[PDB]
């Protein structure tokens, strides 16, 4: 009964949405160990999928984005086959792949990630790496993100230009990302597994 293999796809679609929603909650509340366990469950479930749609792919991208942000300050961790990419540069690529739902907020989060990707290098004393990151993000004779001229100056004058990074800090990036996660929590809070699970708890 190949219908079974099709019933496994449905149950799998449900588990995926449930793990995402649970990962988003651990991110918002600061539960590192819960985040790690839910991450390992999600990793395996993704490996076992037999089919895929654009909706499920977007849900996967959201989980990936959060794992990179959580390691934003861990400069030597590597997430991509190319060893030169830092965690924030990896988060930015993923964010470019998630189809926009809230144009304004999406563009704000994007500009803040581009800025911090360099700032975390500057504040640790890695002037050379910041220069490498800058070249990989803005390195292209064309007009994108208008902060290019400012950040180039900051890099030349090899010293943490706190003055600027203060008004577009790590904390300000984290606040905007957590406002996005709330919009995700509200939408997915109505998925099959979560809803059914609540009724049992209410009894």
């Amino acid at each position: 009964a190949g219908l079974v293999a099709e019933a496994e796809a449905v149950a799998a679609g449900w588990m995926l949405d449930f793990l995402c929603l649970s990962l988003c909650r651990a991110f918002r509340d600061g539960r590192s160990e819960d985040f790690r366990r839910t991450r390992n469950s999600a990793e395996a479930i993704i490996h076992g999928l037999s089919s895929l749609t654009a909706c499920q792919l977007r849900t996967i991208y959201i989980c990936q984005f959060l794992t990179r942000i959580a390691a934003g300050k861990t400069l030597d961790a590597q997430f991509e086959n190319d060893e030169r990419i830092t965690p924030l540069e990896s988060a930015l690529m993923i964010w470019g792949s998630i189809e926009k739902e809230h144009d304004k907020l999406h563009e704000e989060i994007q500009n803040l990630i581009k800025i911090q990707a360099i700032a975390v290098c500057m504040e640790n004393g890695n002037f050379k790496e910041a220069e490498e990151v800058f070249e990989r993000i803005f390195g292209d004779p064309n007009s994108h993100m208008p902060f290019k001229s400012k950040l180039l100056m900051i890099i030349s004058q090899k010293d943490t230009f706190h003055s600027f990074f203060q008004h577009f800090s790590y904390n300000h990036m984290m606040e905007k990302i957590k406002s996005y996660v709330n919009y995700v929590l509200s939408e997915k809070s109505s998925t099959f597994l979560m809803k059914a699970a609540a009724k049992v708890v209410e009894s």
Binding site: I46, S50, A54, I60, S97
Partner: protein, 184 residues
């Protein structure tokens, strides 16, 4: 409907174009197993449905009450007429782990073949992630959708795991694209 006493404009069964690296790089042939087997009733196509220099394809069915036609292509002027008459596309990918891809070309190949200049964009695209047989190491379907940037193409899509020897997954995939057809 708009006509109670007159017959309607004829609707011929759904037709699909099928191409891809999976049609030659696999140790076991997918087309042979499709042909050389049943529950599916493969028959030669009718000469009337001929598409200059290409033919009339192969006919199949799910259960006597569900029929569709497929034009198999092992290369890439004439194909364009196919891209216009066909209702959907089927890309057969090589999902064997030991393989290394040139994700750039594959994307383009699909890109060309599926241009809205030859037809609507509501036409579904089915990607078959195929391997020779059940004991071969396979690359997960998520990785495939990601490396092929399927969203840039603008066509609704689906990736389904398939096995050339037993045809596992083939049915569930066909069944899906037959609905994006009744959605038209």
């Amino acid at each position: 409907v708009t006509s109670f006493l007159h017959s309607l404009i004829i609707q011929n069964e759904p037709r699909f174009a099928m191409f891809g690296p999976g049609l030659e790089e696999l140790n076991t042939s997918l087309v042979l197993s499709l042909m050389s087997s049943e529950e599916l009733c493969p028959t030669a196509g009718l000469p009337q449905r001929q598409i200059d220099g290409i033919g009339s394809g192969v006919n199949f069915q799910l259960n006597n009450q569900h029929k569709f036609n497929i034009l198999i292509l092992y290369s890439t002027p004439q194909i364009q007429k196919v891209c216009e008459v066909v209702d959907g596309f089927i890309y057969v990918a090589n999902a064997e782990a030991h393989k290394r891809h040139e994700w750039q070309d594959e994307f383009s190949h699909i890109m060309a073949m599926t241009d809205p200049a030859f037809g609507s964009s509501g036409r579904p695209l089915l990607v078959l992630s195929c391997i020779s047989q059940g004991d071969v190491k396979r690359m997960p379907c998520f990785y495939l959708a990601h490396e092929l940037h399927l969203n840039l193409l603008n066509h609704p899509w689906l990736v389904q795991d398939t096995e050339a020897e037993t045809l596992t997954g083939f049915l569930n995939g066909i069944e899906w694209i037959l609905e994006e057809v009744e959605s038209k």
